[PDB]
Write a protein that binds this ligand. Sequence first.
Ligand SMILES: CCCCCCCCCCCCCCCCCC(=O)OC[C@H](COP(=O)([O-])OCC(O)COP(=O)([O-])OC[C@@H](COC(=O)CCCCCCCCCCCCCCCCC)OC(=O)CCCCCCCCCCCCCCCCC)OC(=O)CCCCCCCCCCCCCCCCC
Ligand SMILES: CCCCCCCCCCCCCCCCC[C@@H](O)O[C@H](CO[C@H](O)CCCCCCCCCCCCCCC)COP(=O)(O)OCC[N+](C)(C)C
Ligand SMILES: CCCCCCCC/C=C\CCCCCCCC(=O)O[C@H](COC(=O)CCCCCCC/C=C/CCCCCCCC)COP(=O)(O)OCCN
Lengths: 128, 178, 606, 459, 156
Amino acid sequence: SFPKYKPSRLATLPATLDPAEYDISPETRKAQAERLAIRSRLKREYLLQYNDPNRLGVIEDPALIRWTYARSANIYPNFRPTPKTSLLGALFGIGPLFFWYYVFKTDRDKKEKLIQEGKLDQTFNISY
Amino acid sequence: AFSAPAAYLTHQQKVLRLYKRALRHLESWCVHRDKYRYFACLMRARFDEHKNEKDMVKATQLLRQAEEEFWYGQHPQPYIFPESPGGTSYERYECYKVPEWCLDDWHPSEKAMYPDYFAKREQWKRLRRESWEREVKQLQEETPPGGPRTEALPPARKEGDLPPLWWHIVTRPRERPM
Amino acid sequence: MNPFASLTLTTLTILTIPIMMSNSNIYKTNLYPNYVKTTVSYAFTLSLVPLLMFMHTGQEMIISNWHWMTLQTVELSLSFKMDYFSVMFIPVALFVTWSIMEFSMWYMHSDPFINRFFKYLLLFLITMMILVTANNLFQLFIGWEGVGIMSFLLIGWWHGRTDANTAALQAILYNRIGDIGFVLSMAWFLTHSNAWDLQQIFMLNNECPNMPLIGLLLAAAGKSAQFGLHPWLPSAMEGPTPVSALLHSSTMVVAGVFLLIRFYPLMETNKLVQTMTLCLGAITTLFTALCAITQNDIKKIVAFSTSSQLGLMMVTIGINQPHLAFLHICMHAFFKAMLFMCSGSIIHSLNDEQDIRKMGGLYKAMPFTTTALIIGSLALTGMPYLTGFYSKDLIIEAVNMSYTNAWALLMTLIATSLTAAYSTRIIFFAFLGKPRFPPLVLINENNPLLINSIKRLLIGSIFAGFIISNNIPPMTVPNTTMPLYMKMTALIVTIMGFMLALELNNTTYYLKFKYPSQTYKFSNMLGYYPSIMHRLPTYHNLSMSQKSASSLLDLIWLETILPKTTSFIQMKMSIMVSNQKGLIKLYFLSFLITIMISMTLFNYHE
Amino acid sequence: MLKIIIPTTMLLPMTWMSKHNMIWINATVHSLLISLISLSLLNQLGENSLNFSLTFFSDSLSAPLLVLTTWLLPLMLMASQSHLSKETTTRKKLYITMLILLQLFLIMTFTATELILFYILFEATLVPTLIIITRWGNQTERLNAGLYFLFYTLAGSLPLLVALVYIQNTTGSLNFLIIHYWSHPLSNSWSNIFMWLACIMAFMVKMPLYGLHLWLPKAHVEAPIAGSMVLAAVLLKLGGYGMMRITTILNPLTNYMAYPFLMLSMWGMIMTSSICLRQTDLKSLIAYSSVSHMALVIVAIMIQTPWSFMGATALMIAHGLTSSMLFCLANTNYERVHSRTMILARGLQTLLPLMATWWLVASLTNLALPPSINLIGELFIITASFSWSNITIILMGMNMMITALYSLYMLITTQRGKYTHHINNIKPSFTRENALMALHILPLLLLTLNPKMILGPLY
Amino acid sequence: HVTKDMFPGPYPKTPEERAAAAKKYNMRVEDYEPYPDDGMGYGDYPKLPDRSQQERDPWYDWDHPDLRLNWGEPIHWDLDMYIRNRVDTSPTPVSWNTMCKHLFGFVAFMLFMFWVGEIYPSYQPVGPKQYPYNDLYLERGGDPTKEPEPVVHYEI
Ligand SMILES: CCCCCCCCCCCCCCCCCC(=O)OC[C@H](COP(=O)([O-])OCC(O)COP(=O)([O-])OC[C@@H](COC(=O)CCCCCCCCCCCCCCCCC)OC(=O)CCCCCCCCCCCCCCCCC)OC(=O)CCCCCCCCCCCCCCCCC
Ligand SMILES: CCCCCCCCCCCCCCCCC[C@@H](O)O[C@H](CO[C@H](O)CCCCCCCCCCCCCCC)COP(=O)(O)OCC[N+](C)(C)C
Ligand SMILES: CCCCCCCC/C=C\CCCCCCCC(=O)O[C@H](COC(=O)CCCCCCC/C=C/CCCCCCCC)COP(=O)(O)OCCN
């Protein structure tokens, strides 16, 4: 009927337009029930420490520790030199350096050639 | 925001949510009140046209087509209440909300001001201390051995009991703390 | 000495006294906002006198009163330029700031940190005076950055709100983008001209090259929110209404236009930069005016109006008419600040409601606000003999009588029509019809502070154009001979805008519903520019910053090459050396091998 | 110059012969007095240095560094006496002894007349910092951080020792004045290229140069607060001082031997500023800020112009002060929440307003807000690089944008939004921390009134 | 108090390892999927929907309201890029690849028409302006020691 909306990476698919919520199975209901059970258990575990009168300290969050450890310390142990890894590393590490070197070297060569022929209009250039 | 959510939304809940959302967006399109009344009565007629079908497959297909209709015809700039998650005054007063535990860090000279309030706060703290273990015991009694299944909390069943996990819900700062 | 220099420095130095008293026992009292407002009013009264002296004899000065540092040949000094632009702009800015502070005393009455708010407003005014009166590029850069930082601090006033912080950081980014060009201009003018002072730069550059002027244009586009760098100005409406009225409406957003006006002796000699400025201004004044005509938040509509006026100012600069641009700045300040004050009064009286779709019949409910906003819209639309007639109509006339890009001319005319279009929308959806707000009527505009603050700039928006335009000396050759149909172009297009917008608005009463077209969606979603440029470049930058720079390069390969490789090699060599089972039978044979090798290799050729 | 060295040495017997409850007071008071005495060295001449004796001298580049080094010890003592409360008296005195030895080595390094004594003290500074990091560090990664920090420096600087010894054999002396007066060019030979490399990398490692900076995010994060302050404020400036000293022998080989280093630094400022945009650790963000800022000093030194030298000196001073202030600010929050994650404790402006003001001022100073001395140095270097090549302005402007971006990102994440509900042990700011912030920030603003004191000998 | 088993490890290769990892991150085994086992160092850590934090339900009572996260739930790898002060992935009324087409077309059309109008400018039917003294030769710079070419203007 109407023109159709298609999701993208930075404009994702709405839940109301996603077919998965309009073809439901008892397997899906069981999965949702277990997900809610997990969330409820985590919420209870958090609120039991949260509402405790006696405790006077930051409540530890293992999820945050896992996130930071994975993002910082866990990277090298799970690093393998692979074709994609090596190509991406070589490109992103070396290509910009030689690109900028070429640009600056050509610019300075042109400027020096212009100096040696006395063509830059360098009057009033004192502070360099 | 005050009710523990369920595992999933039933068909009736989805249809009601869509009805409210479509009415809000139609009101956004129909600025004047009488025109909105006319088109909202038409919208109610359109929803009631299929309320009595006993076939769930065709009802679900109707719901899918209705969601596609809404997403194609929605207002790009729908009206939002000022204090709503998209409103212009959503979190305007969150920097003025100070938690109650900050009052324990005051200087004795600051507590020399407001003596009666701090006496009331002290008796509130005593009340909170005297009830914690009973709340914990009730919580560990009334839950299944395999962990809770819902975020809903039980009330106080006896006479000398306060509802479990009440302190941070009762001692909210305010909407307008200053 | 004659009073000119003393009064011009005093009107700037007496704005800092309430800043020094911010730690005394006046800052902890409810009297501080009144103290700051009184100081600003006294500063305006004092600054009125150098304006009179210039009005009499055209007296102008530069004041280098303090020497900061000398780097070799170059001398950096605290130098103030007190020319026509500065002595004409300081009183207008002080008048607008006085009105906005008197309005703030009522609108920020329930704010627990009103004293801080007043201190911040004063700080912004001081930085703006520093920017305007600067004689060298370093001082003007100090003002340029001070106004930006005060914008950052005032946009994110409610620092508990996520969107206020987002808007503040967005403004900072969009202004750093133009700061790049500002630094380019400074560097070029220092290496090439050997000075940062205005007097030397003008003298040594009789035919200015492209780079410094393009840098100045980039900086002005960043500060004045032109089409490339526009979206931060509408987002800057997160802050309190007084902040939007003072900074992002009439005083801060004209800083890039002021910078381009200050360098007009160098822009006279360049035509490519003039063409670029003309095209940028034309596209900006078209695009923002087109975006405004479908907006429902009143503050957003007035922000887009401000951006369109800034685009028109850039157009005026791009046709070699800088004095007209300065005049338009001075005229536009009055009625645009007044429009924001009226919108803020409406917002306050309707319990923080900003959508015009929930604003009904206020023509009789708020008579003074309606009168003020009608007069402001008439001034805004270049109604004849209003303060906007003495600047905007002359701008249109100059653009019609010049060797001009034709597309820019057409876009300027269409923007002139769209101005009346959007203005009609604010009046139609805000003041005519039946009420659409919640039933608990809290409407009340009977406060002397609000009334007097609005009334001062009302009188200004009525009479300032006639008062000023007949008192400044002529620095422009007029367009004395014009065809009659072109003399009345602006009025005709404004009338057509009024009629077409009124017809399409009256169409809304009909009991007919239809889905929006694609043109409406393009106009209402700001051309999808924030929907794309705020998501694609930011995502790609933030993903490359971690995937490539952080993880792949810094944590993996730079680690792999120098330290991990040498660690592995030393470990392997240590293992290789250290695993002998201690059997003499092996290393005595090794000794024999060594002995034999030594005799032949090192013995038979000494 | 002994009028400053002898009191710094006498600081040790006073520390060891003090009562257990009076060590901090005596140390702070006498360190402040030594700083006041050292303030007298800012009276520099216009033509030549202050040749105190055959062993020591002082120029317009050494004096600001000496004043910063003397002023920093009181701040480290102030910041250290919080987390060392439970220590024993002997361990506290040993920590103060390490700090005093560090100050003495730095003071004698910045005024050494010859390059061999300069090298000896420039490497003697390693043992106290290494001991501090590996003994009073908090986590288990301090051992790896110490190993990285030690070995990068030693591997970079042993060839410097070999090159200096060779230079003395070929020239007859390593006195800086004689070298400067008897300067002679390098022929374009492979041997001269490698002698250039040996004389340069020793200081590139400690700037640090991009790609040679891996040790810095480890050492600055794992070290205690005083160790981090001295690492960021003074120890990074040793490389810059050494380079500006030693490029006298190097010309003209530098005109083309500086291309790889210039490319590395001007791209690495962008890379490190981008790394700062996604950092889950606050201290790591502050550490990467240091590399991003010192790449510009590397550029200024390498392009060999007076404006670049003046900007480099100003930027070194400003960076030292700002980085020390930022590290102290982060330590104040760490001592509350006992974690370094940035998103753990948020919305701290509601709870600690004066620390919020200090955070705002430090962030404004970091992003080079005019007329800060940060701006003076950075703008002078930018102008010098523009004179070197106009295309450098693209990288300089992009770096200025990203610096402000991550600075205000760090400010907003930590100080804005809503406070975490469960951190209920955030006590009000102590007088000691506020005084630390004020003593960090007041000299920065005061130096704007007399910027010629930190612009070096080229002024 | 996090011991050895609670930290991320290497990529799980057997179903038992995947089940243990899913238990570690408080996830369902049917919902747990790590990143592809390349050499990027992702390892054990779980891959979650690339949703932003703006898409999360604003009416739910989160443990962290501004971040919109619950206490024990697993955290996305790119959380700091989706903090809703930053990159947003929420659905839009107009689809992508259509917003891009319209924006690019508008910008390109504006540039093309500006170039066209530069090719065909708009002016008035008048002659060039005339200035008296040798086209203001002395006032526009001077150089009074060359006696420039005299330009002469006549009444018409
Ligand atoms: C002096 C001698 C010379 C005489 C000159 C001419 C004389 C008079 C001629 C008059 C001509 C008509 C003037 C009115 C225009 C139409 C008014 C209107 O709004 O109609 C609504 C109608 C449908 O609206 P709707 O969606 O049903 O609205 C839903 C609700 O009602 C929503 O309701 P709401 O409450 O949101 O209100 C909506 C709001 C907003 O309304 C809209 O939604 C549409 C607004 C946009 C159109 C406004 C005109 C702007 C034109 C700028 C063109 C610049 C070049 C752009 C090039 C782009 C190239 C891609 O309504 C208004 O703002 C009022 C209407 C506009 C007021 C101003 C009109 C006067 C100024 C223009 C005429 C100037 C006359 C004097 C000129 C002097 C110098 C020559 O749309 C139109 O009629 C306008 C369409 C024209 C533009 C189409 C552009 C093509 C788009 C697709 C192209 C193909 C793309 C293929 C893919 C390419 C990918 C690369
Ligand atoms: C992770 C980053 C850490 C820091 C890295 C620092 C990088 C240090 C490199 C310094 C660059 C200069 C070194 C050599 C000078 C020029 C190199 C060569 O390309 O120049 C050409 C030389 O031609 C050939 O290329 C010869 C060099 C071939 C051997 C060098 C191979 C190096 C490639 C990879 C280097 C890796 C560096 C890092 C080591 C771990 C010029 O030709 P020509 O004018 O005729 O000879 C000039 C020299 N003269 C005057 C003495 C005669
Ligand atoms: C953390 C990593 C840092 C590692 C830095 C290591 C590289 C340092 C740069 C080179 C170091 C060795 C140079 C030698 C010291 C100077 C001696 C000198 O200047 O005299 C030369 C000596 O020149 C040499 O002998 C050169 C020997 C080089 C062999 C060792 C090469 C090591 C690797 C070179 C590249 C490393 C530099 C950059 C690497 C950066 C880190 C990746 C002249 O020889 P003459 O006897 O006078 O003969 C001429 C007249 N008949």
